[PDB]
Amino acid sequence: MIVKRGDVYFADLSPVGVRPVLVIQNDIGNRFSPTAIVAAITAQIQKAKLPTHVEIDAKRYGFERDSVILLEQIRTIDKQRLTDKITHLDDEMMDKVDEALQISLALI
Amino acid sequence: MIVKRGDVYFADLVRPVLVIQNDIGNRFSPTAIVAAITAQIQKAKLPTHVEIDAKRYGFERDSVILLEQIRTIDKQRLTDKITHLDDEMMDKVDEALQISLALID
Amino acid sequence: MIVKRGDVYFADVRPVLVIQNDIGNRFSPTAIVAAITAQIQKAKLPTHVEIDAKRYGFERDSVILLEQIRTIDKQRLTDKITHLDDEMMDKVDEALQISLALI
Amino acid sequence: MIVKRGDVYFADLSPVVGSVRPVLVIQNDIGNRFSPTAIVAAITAQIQKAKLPTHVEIDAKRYGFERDSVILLEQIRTIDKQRLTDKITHLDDEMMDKVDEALQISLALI
Amino acid sequence: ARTEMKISLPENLVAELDGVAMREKRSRNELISQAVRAYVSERTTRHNRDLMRRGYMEMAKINLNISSEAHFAECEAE
Amino acid sequence: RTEMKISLPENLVAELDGVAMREKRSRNELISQAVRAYVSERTTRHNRDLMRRGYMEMAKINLNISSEAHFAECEAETT
């Protein structure tokens, strides 16, 4: 499967619930590697509560409800757990993810 | 508790793990972001890999760090320390973390 | 050598307490110290500070003599035996002001 | 002998007499009476100006010195009073307030 | 550079300030400006550190839950 | 209480008022406190540097006389 950095998918978090997820790993590895590095997404909040958060508008990106990407919550998973590709985020939204990630991992 | 960036601890499921979160998150949050450490490879050349020879950082084993293999767990699975990587070592790690995450080029 | 105010050393052999400011303790050949003796275990003067053996790793209970102070060459400082906390140094401070009438 | 805090004497720095440097008594007066030892601060004439906040200048004409001198509050030691010979002078409250603040700096006080 | 204003510093503080000026070979404004920057940076930084703590502490229940709910996935990708 | 005229960047004052609205103080109360801290910091460091320089100039004297009076000290010990 061709996953791109910026793609958001549903992921299966079972041993064989389902939660949204944001691919953040480089595209070379996203092709020739079994694993993908992702960043969780939740809808229990609608506003950022940290400089490591990026807001997602529901209507703009086809979500049922407003959500927030959690760049403090990152992990590498098997790509096979990626099922439905919900959307893709533009360069604008990914510049936010970038600076939130550098803060989270002290690349500042 | 006592966790700081660049400290390597043991994990629970055994596993050596480099702590890579910011020191602020490390103090006031239940979760900590680590990077996998393995002894299966001694050399390991590739962009996202960093080399530790044991004869420096109080290590018993020639290990290699994997900035492609990271996870975010509960703080309490971090039991007792090992050492702390000096700045020059951390720079090589970051220099690969950024490649891993596509934050350069 | 980096001597710090509060460091106690052997000197060329009797124990000794460094009491001079830390700037001088770095960029000066000389150090000002205060003798220490073990012929008594209790203070007999307001110019004395007691030192517990077990707390500060001494063979026997000792007393600092803030009436006995002199400046020596740092080179005579050999083994660093210990360092005194802020608590113990507040005692040395008020004992020293009495000894030298800094009320 | 009745030595007072502020008195400056000559002192004999030999193993017995086999002949001497100026010296300033800085210990409290109670101890200066009922104790064999005295705590003093050296004085030199190799300089005429203070080169440190631990120095106090002494004018020659005002205090009857041959040549302008400086008290060295980094140079202090306790000696036997018996080595105090000539009393050369005594310093006023003004000059002793200087010695006081120079001493607290030298020993990290107050 | 931009805005311009009016202050009242103690006579001693300015006298001292000119001391450090005559020495480091700069002007008053170059020094006042540098001083305001340092102070404001110091305050902003500390404020931000305090907002980060407060946020992390508010997010504990969520971050913990979801760190567990995806534990197995992590362990398999080992 | 001298008085003067300064020119701060538009962004720095905007930020400055931020910390003012928060800590409930005025611009001048903050600028004044900022100049103090900076000047204290500079004066202190300057003085530490003059103390070092002086100690290093006084080494030859201080050492000599520390030795010249060594015996006197050693006698006033166990006395």
* Beta-strand relationship, D55-58 and D69-80: antiparallel
> Count of CB atoms within 10 A of residue E52's CB?
21
Most distant CA pair in chain D, distance: 42
DSSP, residue by residue, A18-52: EEEEEE-S-TTHHHH-SEEEEEEEESS-SS--STT
Rg of chain C in Å (alpha carbons): 13
Q: Does domain A2-108 have CATH number 2.30.30.110?
A: yes
The whole-angstrom distance between A80's CA and the closest CA on chain B is: 16
Q: In three state form, how does the secondary structure of chain D look?
A: CCCCCCEEEEECCCCCCCCCEEEEECCCCCHHHHCCEEEEEEEECCCCCCCCCCEEEECCCCCCCCCCEEEEEEEEEEEEHHHEEEEEEECCHHHHHHHHHHHHHHCCCC
Distance CA B31, CA E63 (A): 7
> Residue A8: helix, strand or coil by DSSP?
strand
Residue C45 contacts by C-beta under 8 Å, 6 or more apart in sequence? C67
What are the phi and psi torsion angles at C7 (to 5°)? -75, 135
Residue type, D53: P
Q: Report the distance separating Cα C66 and Cα F8, nearest Å.
A: 54
Q: Crossing angle, helix F10-23 and helix E28-69, to 10 degrees?
A: 60
Query: Angle, to 10 degrees, between the axis of helix F27-68 and the axis of helix E11-24?
Result: 60
Spans of all domains in chain E: 1-78
Pairing of strands C77-83, C14-18: unpaired
Write a three-state SS string for chain E.
CCCCEEEECCHHHHHHHHHHHHHHCCCHHHHHHHHHHHHHHHHHHHHHHHHHHHHHHHHHHHHHHHHHHCHHHHHHCC
Query: Angle CA(A106)–CA(B3)–CA(B5) in degrees, nearest 5?
Result: 25
CA distance C50 to C35: 13
The answer to whether A5 faces chain B, any CB pair under 8 Å, is yes
Q: Which positions in chain C touch F62 (Cβ < 8 Å)?
A: 28-30, 71
Shortest CB distance from E72 goes to which of A13, A40, A49? Answer: A13
Q: Could you tell me which residues are beta bridge partners of residue D95?
A: none
C37 CB-side CA count, 13 A: 14
Kindly give the residue spans of alpha helices, DSSP state H, lying in F4-77.
10-23, 27-68, 70-75
> What kind and span of H or E run contains C38?
none
Is-contact D102 D56, C-beta < 8 A?
yes
CATH class entry, domain B2-105: mainly beta
Interface residue E78 vs chain A (CB under 8 A): no
Q: Domain F1-79, what fold?
A: Arc Repressor Mutant (1.10.1220)
Separation CA A45–CA C29 (nearest Å): 65
Hey, are the CB atoms on E67 and A19 less than 8 Å from each other? Answer: no
Contact F76 C68 (CB under 8 A): yes
CATH 1.10.1220.10 fits E1-78, yes or no: yes
What is the number of residues in chain B? 105
The answer to whether the Cβ–Cβ distance between D53 and F51 falls below 8 Å is yes
Instruction: Provide the token pair at C94.
Output: 């008020």
**Residue extents of the structural domains in chain B:** 2-105
C5 contacts D108 by C-beta, under 8 angstroms: yes
B46: left (phi over 0), alpha (psi -120 to 50) or beta: left
Determine whether the interchain pair F77/C28 forms a contact, defined as Cβ–Cβ distance below 8 Å: no
Letter for the amino acid at C75? Q
Cα distances (Å, whole numbers) of residue F75 to C35, C68, C75, D73: 13, 11, 20, 22
Phi, psi dihedral angles at E59 (to 5 degrees): -95, 0
Question: How far, in Å, CA of E19 to CA of B70, rounded?
Answer: 55
Are D13 and F61 within 8 A, CB to CB?
A: no
CATH topology of domain C2-103: SH3 type barrels. (2.30.30)
Is the CB of residue F2 less than 8 Å from the CB of residue E14? yes
Q: How far is CA F79 from CA C32, D80, F44, F74, in A?
A: 20, 9, 42, 9
Q: E73 touching B, CB under 8 A?
A: no
State phi, psi for C102 to the nearest 5 degrees: -100, 25
Return the residue in B17, B22, B66, B75 with the most chain A beta carbons within 10 A, the one to mutate for interface testing.
B22
- Asked if the C-beta of B24 comes within 8 angstroms of chain E's C-beta atoms, the answer is yes
Q: Which residue from E15, E23, E11, C6 is spatially nearest to F50, judged by alpha carbons? A: E23
Closest-CA distance, D27 to chain C, in angstroms, reads: 4
Q: Residue D46 and residue F71: Cβ atoms within 8 Å?
A: no
What is the spatial distance between Cα D94 and Cα D92, in angstroms, rounded to a whole number? Answer: 5
Would you identify the CATH topology of the domain D2-110?
SH3 type barrels. (2.30.30)
β-sheet with A35-42: strand ranges across: A53-56, A67-78, A35-42, A18-23, A7-12, A82-88
8 Å CB contact between C68 and F72: no
Taking the Cβ of residue A101 and every Cβ of chain B, the question of whether any pair is shorter than 8 Å is answered with yes
Amino acid at E20: V
- What is the rounded distance in angstroms from the CA atom of residue D65 to the CA atom of residue D71? 13
Residue A20: closest CA among A94, A79, A76, A85: A85
Nearest to B68 among A37, A72, A74 (CB): A37
Three state DSSP letters for C40-99: CCCCCCCCEEEECCCCCCCCCCEEEEEEEEEEEEHHHEEEEEEECCHHHHHHHHHHHHHH
Q: Is F53 helix (H, G, I), strand (E, B) or coil?
A: helix
- Rg over alpha carbons for chain D, rounded to the nearest Å, is 13
Whole-angstrom distance, CA of residue D19 vs CA of residue D58: 26
For residue A80, give Cα distances in angstroms to A32, A84, D13, E73: 13, 11, 91, 11
* Element spanning A15, H or E: none
In three-state secondary structure terms, F3 is: strand
D46 and chain F in contact, CB less than 8 A: yes
Helix axes E28-69, F27-68, angle to 10 degrees: 100
Tell me how far apart the alpha carbons of residues D83 and D22 are, in angstroms, rounded to a whole number. 11
How many Cβ atoms are within 10 Å of A35's Cβ, its own excluded?
A: 17
Cα C13 to Cα C35, C37, C60, D80, F62: the distances in Å are 11, 11, 16, 21, 23
Buried b (16+ CB within 10 A) or exposed e, D14-39: eeeeeeeebbbbbbbeebbeeeebbb
Distance CA A50, CA A73 (A): 12
Which residues of chain D lie closer than 8 angstroms to C66, CB-CB?
Answer: none
Minimum-distance CB partner of C67 among D31, D75, D110: D31
Q: Which two tokens stand for residue D59?
A: 């004018």
Which residue from D74, F19, B20 is spatially nearest to C69, judged by alpha carbons? Answer: D74
d(CA C35, CA C16): 5
Confirm if C2 and C9 have CB atoms less than 8 A apart.
no
Distance CA D5, CA D96 (A): 9
Alpha-carbon gap, residue D22 to D54, rounded angstroms: 17
Three-class SS of residue F10? helix
d(C-alpha E73, C-alpha C96), whole Å: 67
- Residue F50, chain C, CB below 8 Å: the answer is no
- Phi–psi pair at D77, nearest 5 degrees: -160, 155
d(CA C99, CA F31): 44
DSSP state for residue C37 in the 8-state scheme:
E
Q: Interface partners of C (3+ CB pairs, < 8 Å)?
A: D, F
Q: Taking a C-beta distance cutoff of 8 angstroms, is the pair D71, F62 a contact? A: no
Name residue A12's amino acid.
D
Say if the Cβ atoms of A24 and B70 lie within 8 Å: no
Nearest to C102 by CA among E73, D57, D108: D108
Report the DSSP beta bridge partners of residue D38: D79
Question: How would you class B26 by CB atoms within 10 Å of its CB: exposed for 0-12, middle for 13-18, buried for 19 or more?
Answer: buried
Give φ, ψ of C99 to 5 degrees. Answer: -55, -35
Q: Which residues of F16-50 are buried (b: 16+ CB within 10 A; e: fewer)?
A: beebbeeeeeebeebbbebbbebbeebeeeeeeee
